[PDB]
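Troubleshooting entry. The earlier prediction with zinc ion gave an output that would not parse, so I re-checked the input for stray whitespace and re-submitted. Clean input:
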Amino acid sequence: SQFPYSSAPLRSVKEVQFGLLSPEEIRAISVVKIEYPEIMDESRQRPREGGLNDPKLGSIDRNFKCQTCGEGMAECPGHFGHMELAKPVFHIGFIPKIKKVCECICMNCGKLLLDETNPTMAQAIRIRDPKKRFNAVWQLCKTKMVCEADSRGGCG
Amino acid sequence: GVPALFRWLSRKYPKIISPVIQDEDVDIDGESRPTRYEDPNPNGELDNLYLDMNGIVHPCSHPEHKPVPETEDEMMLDVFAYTENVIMMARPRKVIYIAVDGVAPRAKMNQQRSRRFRSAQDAKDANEKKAAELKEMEKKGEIIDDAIKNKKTWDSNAITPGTPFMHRLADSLRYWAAYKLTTDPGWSGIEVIISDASVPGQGQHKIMSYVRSLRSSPKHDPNTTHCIYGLNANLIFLGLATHEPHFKILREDVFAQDKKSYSLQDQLRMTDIERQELKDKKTPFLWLHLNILREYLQIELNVPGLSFPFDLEKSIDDWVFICFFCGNNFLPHLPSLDVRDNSITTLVTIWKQILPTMKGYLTTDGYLNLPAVERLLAELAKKEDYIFRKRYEDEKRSLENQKRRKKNEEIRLWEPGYRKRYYETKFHTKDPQKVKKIARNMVQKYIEGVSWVLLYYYQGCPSWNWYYPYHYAPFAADFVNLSELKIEFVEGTPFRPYEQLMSVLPAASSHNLPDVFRSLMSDANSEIIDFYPEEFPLDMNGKKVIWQAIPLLPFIDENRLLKAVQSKYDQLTEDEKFRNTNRSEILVLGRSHSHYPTLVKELYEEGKDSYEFQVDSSGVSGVAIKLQSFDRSGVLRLPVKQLEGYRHYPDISNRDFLMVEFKQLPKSHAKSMILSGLIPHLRRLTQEDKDSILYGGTNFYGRNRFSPEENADFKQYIGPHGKSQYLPRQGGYKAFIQIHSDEAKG
Amino acid sequence: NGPNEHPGAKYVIRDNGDRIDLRYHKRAGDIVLQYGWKVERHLMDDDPVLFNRQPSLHKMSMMAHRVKVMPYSTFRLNLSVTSPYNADFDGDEMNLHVPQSEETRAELSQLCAVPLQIVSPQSNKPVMGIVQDTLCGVRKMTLRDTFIEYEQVMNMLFWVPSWDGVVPQ
Amino acid sequence: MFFLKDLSLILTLHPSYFGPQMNQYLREKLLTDVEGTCTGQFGYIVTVLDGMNIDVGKGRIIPGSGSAEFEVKYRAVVWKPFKGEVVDAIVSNVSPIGFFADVGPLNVFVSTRLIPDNLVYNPSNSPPAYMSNDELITKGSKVRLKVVGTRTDVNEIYAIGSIKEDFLGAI
Amino acid sequence: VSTSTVGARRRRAKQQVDDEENATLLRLGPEFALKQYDHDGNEHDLIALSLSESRLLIREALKARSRARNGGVIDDDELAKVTSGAVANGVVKKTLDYLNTFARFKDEETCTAVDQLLHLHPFEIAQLSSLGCEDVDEAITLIPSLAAKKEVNLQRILDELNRLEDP
Amino acid sequence: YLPDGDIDNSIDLSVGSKHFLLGDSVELSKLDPILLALKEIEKESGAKTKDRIITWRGIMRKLLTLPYDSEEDFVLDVVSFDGQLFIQFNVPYLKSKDVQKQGDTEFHKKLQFSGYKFEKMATLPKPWPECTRKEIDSRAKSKCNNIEQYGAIVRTGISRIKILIGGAVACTADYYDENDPLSRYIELKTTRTINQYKDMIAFEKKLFRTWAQCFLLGIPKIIYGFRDDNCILRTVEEFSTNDIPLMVKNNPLNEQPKKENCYMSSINFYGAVVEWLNESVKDDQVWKLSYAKRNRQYLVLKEVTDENEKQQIVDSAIPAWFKEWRSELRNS
Amino acid sequence: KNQFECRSCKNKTNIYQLHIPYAAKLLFQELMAMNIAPRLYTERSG
RNA sequence: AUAUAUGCAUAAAGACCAGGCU
Ligand SMILES: [Mg+2]
Ligand SMILES: [Zn+2]
Ligand SMILES: [Zn+2]
């Protein structure tokens, strides 16, 4: 009850939804773009604008308040930024799973090697749980090694 | 950086300073609503607003950081915009008093002359260095436009009554007031009083005199609320002299105003988009409430153990007198009491140490009590040994720290018998009898000067001819046998605008002054050539600021200066003679105002020469006189050439407003006490600062931020909360009912 | 009384949440409390506190006790609660937690209280019993050839808190 | 403009008011805190209907605080501005930079750019007015406008209107 | 502060463009859509109140509040004084002063006749029973809802509005 | 003029009681000023007035306050002259009252002087802007008496009856209003400090009495200085004459003592008694009305038939100059 | 100044407040930094 | 017109390594 009063209603978390952050969402939630390698300007405080310690990111000291939320370090939860990459980079935690996807879809038309015509694939589709459904699809589609031209839209 | 005399009241009274609710500006896309006047003021309702117009026109004549406007039409438009913003921020609903500093009295004349001389000198040095740099980079190949070569720096000495610029400013202010009254639906019930530079007086003095004249009417409402806008901090002590609790001061913000120094490159070649951004940069403002200050001083000054009943009004008067004694423009500060406001910190405690023993108050309705101030100064002299020891110890400790980390003066005040050596250092006289006589005369003149200063802000100007004939002041123990001294004043007559123009303007800033008197500064055969030397000595007295040093100058001789001035009235034209006269205030009244039909009937219909007001709808009081030059069938045009995109001003017909000559009520001996029927504001101090200002409980805990945002409401604490003059207390019937109703409920 | 003298208080919480420190408040002798305020008083007698020894193998290793303020710097324990805590007095260190709300005080008093934990659900048998010297003592006390004179009987009867005041034949 | 809406409010009741008259106290809180307010999603709230016997439901005891939370569902009448909707109004202030008009509690501002060139402001008129050939708009005169913008500050709604279309003007 | 029955509408991968409000395109936003939900969650049509209907419902609500508070006892000032709170009182007097002067049908018999006559987007009937209409051209010029209906018959309905209802 | 500083300073009210001056009851109760002002209004009017009963304020105050606050006996003489009514205190009753008052110990005179001292201390002889500092700080060093006074004569009406009421006015708010003098008038009274229910009841009774006193002259505002048993001004507060009945009835501590408001019935009784006097006395008649302890149910009125008693009552009631001026007016 | 805004969803009204451990806040921020989006919803979609 | 600023009365190192305690 020591927090300052807020007009927003207070409740409790009832559901937690997990997922991946899309690049559009990452750009939207960000408040500043980080592009300058340097930290200080000429070593007289006043950190670099757009650097790793931009004042818009947040406030960690009572001398300067946050430039985005306007509160001190006791209330500001911190604000995220975005950094654009020149080339795409793999995710180390997603190295194997992507490869598994590479064994499921075609590398030219981006289509699955098997369709609903196959009976085993048809049964594997009806699995409600995504994890075991994906496991079954990968196990069934890793055996075939050629994209079928016929149609299913395959490139042959 | 916050200045002194204001940082101290931030430290000691942090709770009176409040921020301002600026505006709302644009809400919908494209153009938006202009925030019409009739909406309630979020800062609290305000009736009377008194504007110190000189403090509005001077910084928006030469901004320090904002790039300098060119020409003078843009200057007038900028003044119009700033005044409109200030009025919309304060939102007065009864009276706007536009007061411009007129002909100053003789007491301030020496300071005025020093300030004008320094302004001319450093402006000349600055433009000489600027031209040298222009030539230097011309040798480097830089291109300079004609708007920068021929156009020199604007002379700040032009802010002086009698110059054509003041006439243009007065005409522009009259036109702007008439236009605002005739086009704004929210200004229908407002009377605008203009007291331009033609009217003798000085700004805040005119405001104080008007408030005093208002208080002299028995029908005056004591619940009216006043506000003063001004850059001078002394107004903080001026409002407490009015003894009107519903009082406040609007000031430019100092804490949050991160003033960044800008060079000429940040003025000349910076872009027009940034020009508009700086124009639209909402400068924060501070509300400084004086009722909260009175609440603080009611508890602070309530020292126990007194042989006489405690009166908060006389204590307020004594506190204001001490504050004026510590520092004022008319008299130089004492040698002992120095480092500005810390002196105020000292004497008050001295007063607290001497009040129980003394039987009488220091001042009574602006009149000094000689024995009381004499014993106060005697105790100050007794402590002068410790004060001099402390300040010289601070100086020597600064010298030691500097050593560790890295007219001839040489007085050495730490040695005994420093008074005589200081006397021959400042006077070059070794005769003990002459030194004693000079010291006695200086003491008598300084007593007369503090009396003059205290009467000036309390009972009007007592003498327009008095002036301090020295450059320094004696120490406290020189003030002995003060009851024997006699003080007398002669009212005299205020000087003509041309006389003050002669007195304060230098020889290097005579372009604005008419060519008739130019030979009185330029010709070497002139009999008054000696009052304007090219260079003058400066006595530092020990400091580092250039202009804070003593400006050693030949004192003006009044008699022959007068003779020279009156020897050359026959060469002036009709307009120059009309600019060399003193007139009365101007009252401007709307067509839809309730007082308009009555004034028209009593002036332009009944043929009467004068009409008496007393209390009216707008709360003014005085005498209205028909003004001959005002033709009702004419058209009032803007005296300023219109620039691009500055809110095009149409031509105002004279049938839509009335302009009359205004006089105040006859002068009377004003008392220092609250009127009957006053409704106190809602109590704002709650059992924390009340004992913090008394004991050491959370008083020295330094919170070095002092941001005014900690209150952020300042709304219910403005108007006269309640409907009873006397608050419930002890065993009154209504109080009894209230307290037992509360007890039954809880 | 102040924070330096027991019993006393440390802080005074206003209705709006402002805190007054009694250490720096030297004029606390003439302060009045308002209804709805909170006073952070010292730990008094009969205050339920959680009391724990690590590692906590089972629920009996963390129980609610009643505070008795005593001199010296060691926690005092009954000898019968050492076995559920699996503790001895050769240098053991134990922890104490103070609830800060009425609901959690009631929860500790009605759920985690020591008397409610005498019988454990692991083997439907008690986990606290008469141990160490007392046990040996009763073996030397209830022997057939043990006889007590009148004065010692009166002293022992008075030593019983739950004695009914009737001397048996 | 006037719409009928279904609203729900969460009300917190202190334990000090846990008495037999708590239903009436909750009703009084609802009456105080609904009418006269404005919201971004719903607009200005005009008033509530059938509030004498509204169902307050059962309270929710907040753990650790002891206050009771009530979810009150009710039927109310509200007022919300619309883009492009024409409406009749009575004007209040007339200025060269524009003039205001009142539609219920809402103030709609019409800028000078949005008046046809036939109407001309004149300060000499009593009261000051926009006049034209057989056209007169003083203070307090009935006018027709079309909303061309709305913006919300949670507490209030601000709108701008235009009279630059056919069959729009004073009536 | 207050909430309605319609909610949820969490974030989706693809954003929606048709979000801004415009009465010319007959778009009212998610809050005031064609179908709303009652206490039990059943689908119901949007309820639009015309100025005469709004006047009747406000008078009924104020008289019900007077019955609840005073207990069985006419003027706009009295109805404004029925409620409490400075903001609420100001809002209610402002809306009553706006509504009484611009109410086309101020009597209950004409209100009942309009009910019947009215007996189609509710915004259309609200705007027809809200603002004065005398000609087909001005009716379609003021708001384009009547311009494109494909079953217009504005002649007969406007003749009814001018003669059967209050001219 | 009285700021909060005077209240905070605990101004004593019993100081100077040794040299307090008293006025004669007969001289102060005479109708000389009212009859005189009648003489000027008659001279500069030229025709007889429309008033019916001519009297002081205190007589009607007591006669209206009687039904509910009746701890004082009164006998009054009524003279019907030229169609007008003159009401005065009975001269034998005046001397009996003086005799019984001469032995009233010292507490009652102490309270009376405390009230007069509060009146002297709370007011100024001139408006505040025209007053000096000597005339403000010397209020406590002045002389207090009841002879020195200022009064107003006001025409009031009730039912179909016109009354010319003379009454003393303590002071005015800030200035004299020529448009409506009665709007700025103000009355000052002193009561003991309130500390319990008995004090509440006593103060409500005093409030009803002084409201009856003040409402006759139409004075809107009243001021009350509450003092302790040491005659020290403890507090001060304001009241409005029109607002007294509503706040008295709607008292949170005692919301329902009585379903019958005393004020409305007091007005009704005043109307009944004034019409009773209107059509109970004929022309050229002298009557005596009375109320004492023994009745407690009714007021007694009798007609005097003694020639000597009637002549002496007329002589002691109406001065010779008024009679001769009336005769001159009748002749002219 | 009582201003709540969400840049991504252009929201200013449907915003709630929660009381959570600071370690939970740090964990959620780190998960966001690792391209994982844990969304806290106060209502059950069902 | 003010007047310069020449001033600041609490900030919280954390991460690893080694040796012991029950
Ligand atoms: Mg062990
Ligand atoms: Zn932040
Ligand atoms: Zn393929």
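This one parsed fine. Chains D and F do not touch (no CB pair under 8 Å).
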